[PDB]
Design a protein around this ligand. Structure first.
Ligand SMILES: COC(=O)[C@H](CS)NC(=O)OCc1ccccc1
Ligand SMILES: [Zn+2]
Ligand SMILES: [Zn+2]
Length: 229
């Protein structure tokens, strides 16, 4: 079940995988949840996405200390919006190595974000260039194409049935795609489908603004995105 820890929520998804959830009271939109991931890989911990704020992200690290008690080797953040990168300074203060799409790091200052320390680059087929993602262990990083944003990336967890779509994917009962302010409306559907095709064995889809779902999250998201064209 859910574990309330301060103002955040943690949920175990698999033996070595937990979802972190944090909230930002956005005026005119209510208190918006955003999810990321925590993965134990042997004697270290890997984080996918910050919380909305530095303080919340420090709380993620506090939860990790109390519930796992192993060092956080790295974090990867999945685009340059506040829900994914708002807590970068907290990661740096903690001495954690940070990674983002090169384009996310380029965009970070104008989006009001602090850039990650390291830039990921991607092959033409979307897979991360391995040299730019050293020591990522089971994290398999994939750029599906522009969709939710131009820079959005996705992460599969090798050895599990989990893939993380970030803010690209919404669940199978969602009425909308969420924040389309920086979206590529022409390419969104194809990018959602490319995410699915990159992680064909993933039966649990995790995403930023819905609870974990089946692969129907991918098909429904793509079908909704068809309407943008
Ligand atoms: C500061 O906002 C954010 O970081 C995220 C980035 S994806 N935006 C968000 O969650 O917007 C909430 C929203 C806005 C319009 C329509 C649906 C949801
Ligand atoms: Zn976003
Ligand atoms: Zn988001």
């Amino acid at each position: 079940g859910d574990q309330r820890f301060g103002d955040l929520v943690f949920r175990q998804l698999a033996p070595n995988v937990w979802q972190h959830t944090s909230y930002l009271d956005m005026p005119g939109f209510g208190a918006v949840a955003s999810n990321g991931l925590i993965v134990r890989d042997g004697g270290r911990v890997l984080v996918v996405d910050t919380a909305w704020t530095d303080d919340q992200t420090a709380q993620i690290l506090n939860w990790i200390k109390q519930e796992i008690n192993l060092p956080v080797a790295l974090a990867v953040v999945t685009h340059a919006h506040q829900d994914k990168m708002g807590g970068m300074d907290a990661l740096h203060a903690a001495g954690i190595a940070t990674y983002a799409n090169a384009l996310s790091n380029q965009l970070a200052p104008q989006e009001g974000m602090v850039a990650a320390q390291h830039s990921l680059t991607f092959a033409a087929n979307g897979w991360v260039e391995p040299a730019t993602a050293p020591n990522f262990g089971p994290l398999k990083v994939f750029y599906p194409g522009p969709g939710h944003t131009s820079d959005n990336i996705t992460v599969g967890i090798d050895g599990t049935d989990i893939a993380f779509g970030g803010c690209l994917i919404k669940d199978s009962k969602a009425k909308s795609l969420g924040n389309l302010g920086d979206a590529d409306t022409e390419h969104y559907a194809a990018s959602a489908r490319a995410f699915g095709a990159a992680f064909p064995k993933a039966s649990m889809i995790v995403m930023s603004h819905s609870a974990p779902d089946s692969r129907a999250a991918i098909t429904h998201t793509a079908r909704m995105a068809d309407k943008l064209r």
